[PDB]
């Protein structure tokens, strides 16, 4: 059992969903029509990949996923795309009018019209579960749906499913691909509203991903397609422990124990390696030591920040492919005597390690080289607060003049919600500061 239900909200959530589920299918040998030849138990099973796929009597493996967007044109492409047979039509939910980069419309005006239908379809997946573990929620910070509707959904999910675990993959805005001037507003509002209702959230800085595509894959002007294929690899690495089995395999929930010292401190920093082109990977093998050392190059992080100027509260290494503990231990011992790695004084310094022997996979016609071994580091660093600081500053610049605020007030919101949300962010920045101070 231990089923996980994925919920993809808004354009960013949906399109990243497309990348992830395409990638999962290739990893598990699932065809676009949903058939899986290697799977001999027809109509059901207790295998590890069943945490993410349900099975029909006809042998179809169906994603435990819901796609939601307040406008139809993004999900329509799924309905008519390569993997359209993969999803039951009821898993793909669309309204007629989007939130127009407005949190208020996503949470209230437009969102309230479809929220009940969404919860009903989610309920239908959950009742098929024999032991539901929790939810994985994909969304942008900047969009009106990604911000507004997500926070509404997360609130409602806490009511309907109690303390059942809820994880986030949140797309943090970058100006190179930004769509709205008000994305700082939407970011602060959804972060404030979802904070109590999320157990663990993996932020993905679009600029971090943008830079990696430019620097490591030599993509002059990365598209969402370039970004999402890279993002899906990090997501795959994180969910791999749920979808595969193995002796040295460590469940994501075990890492979670280490990553979250306090409820509000639940934002791990992700760092992935190797990201390399076919051209460069040719006749060049990246060893365990090399990819592990790459995890401490800030250029490889999913979020722009400097952990070297912060303190660690946890360090997890999630390997996949040709990797054995001996090489990991050797690589770690080398790194600790050469990197700027400093822990807070109230936490142990040991690195927690997981290994999935299933090697990395790449999507056809993709920019990433196929490698024998990869690693995703999940660390809890005070430095990730830098991402909050940058967003909060941009928020302050506009809110001081109340720029664009009338678009929110016009949809029923009050200025008190802005100030309340900003105060919570200030407390959160202070929290990350407090945990880094030495004990008395």
């Amino acid at each position: 059992m231990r089923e996980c239900i994925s919920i993809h909200v808004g354009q960013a959530g949906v399109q990243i969903g497309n990348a992830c589920w395409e990638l999962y299918c290739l990893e598990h040998g699932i065809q676009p029509d949903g058939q899986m030849p290697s799977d001999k138990t027809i109509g059901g099973g207790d295998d590890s990949f069943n945490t993410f796929f349900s099975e029909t009597g006809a042998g179809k493996h169906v994603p435990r996923a819901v796609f939601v967007d307040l406008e139809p044109t993004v999900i329509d492409e799924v309905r008519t795309g390569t993997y359209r047979q993969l999803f039951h039509p009821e898993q793909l939910i669309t309204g007629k009018e989007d939130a127009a980069n407005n949190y208020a419309r996503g949470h209230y005006t437009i969102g309230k019209e479809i929220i009940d239908l969404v919860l009903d379809r989610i309920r239908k997946l959950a009742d098929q579960c024999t032991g539901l573990q929790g939810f994985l929620v994909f969304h942008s910070f900047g969009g009106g749906t990604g911000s507004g509707f997500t926070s509404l959904l997360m609130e409602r999910l806490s009511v309907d499913y109690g303390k059942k675990s809820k994880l986030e993959f949140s797309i943090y805005p970058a100006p190179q691909v930004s769509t709205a001037v008000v994305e700082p507003y939407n970011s602060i509002l959804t972060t404030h509203t979802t904070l109590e209702h999320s157990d663990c959230a993996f932020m993905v800085d679009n600029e971090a991903i943008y830079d990696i595509c430019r620097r490591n894959l030599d993509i002059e002007r990365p598209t969402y397609t370039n970004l999402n294929r890279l993002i899906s690899q990090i997501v795959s690495s994180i969910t791999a422990s749920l979808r595969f089995d193995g002796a040295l395999n460590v469940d994501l929930t075990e890492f979670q124990t280490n990553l979250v010292p306090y409820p509000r401190i639940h934002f791990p920093l992700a760092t992935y390696a190797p990201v390399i082109s076919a051209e460069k990977a040719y006749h060049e093998q990246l060893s365990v030591a090399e990819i592990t050392n790459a995890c401490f190059e800030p250029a490889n992080q999913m979020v722009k920040c400097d952990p070297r100027h912060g303190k660690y509260m946890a360090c997890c290494l999630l390997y996949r492919g040709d990797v054995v503990p001996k090489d990991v231990n050797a690589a770690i011992a080398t790194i600790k005597t050469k990197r700027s790695i400093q822990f807070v004084d109230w936490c142990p310094t040991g690195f927690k390690v997981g290994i999935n022997y299933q090697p990395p996979t790449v999507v056809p016609g993709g920019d990433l080289a196929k490698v024998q071994r990869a690693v995703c580091m999940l660390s809890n660093t005070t430095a990730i607060a830098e991402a909050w600081a940058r967003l909060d500053h941009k928020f302050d610049l506009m809110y001081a003049k109340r720029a664009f605020v009338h678009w929110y007030v016009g949809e029923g919101m009050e200025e008190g919600e802005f100030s309340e949300a900003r105060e919570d962010m200030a407390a959160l920045e202070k929290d990350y500061e407090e945990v880094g101070v030495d004990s008395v």
Binding site: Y108, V159, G162, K163, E196, V409, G410, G412, M413, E414
Partner: protein, 67 residues
């Protein structure tokens, strides 16, 4: 110890229910507050437009009392 064991699991149930309860109530209040505000904004808009109509009547009226 048996009694303490009961009190601990009862506390966990209580706090879990209290969280569900306060979330349900906090949300219902927000959607209600938002419904009132948005309606009040639209209502104020129509009222201003509806006195533009009353003004136009007064103008056409003023033209008939012009002759």
């Amino acid at each position: 110890k048996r009694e303490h064991e009961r009190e601990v699991i009862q506390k966990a149930i209580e706090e879990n229910n209290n969280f569900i309860k306060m979330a349900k109530e906090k949300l219902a209040q927000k959607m209600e507050s938002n419904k009132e505000n948005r309606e009040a904004h639209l209502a104020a808009m129509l009222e201003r437009l509806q006195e533009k109509d009353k003004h136009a009547e007064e103008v056409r009226k003023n033209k008939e009392l012009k002759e």
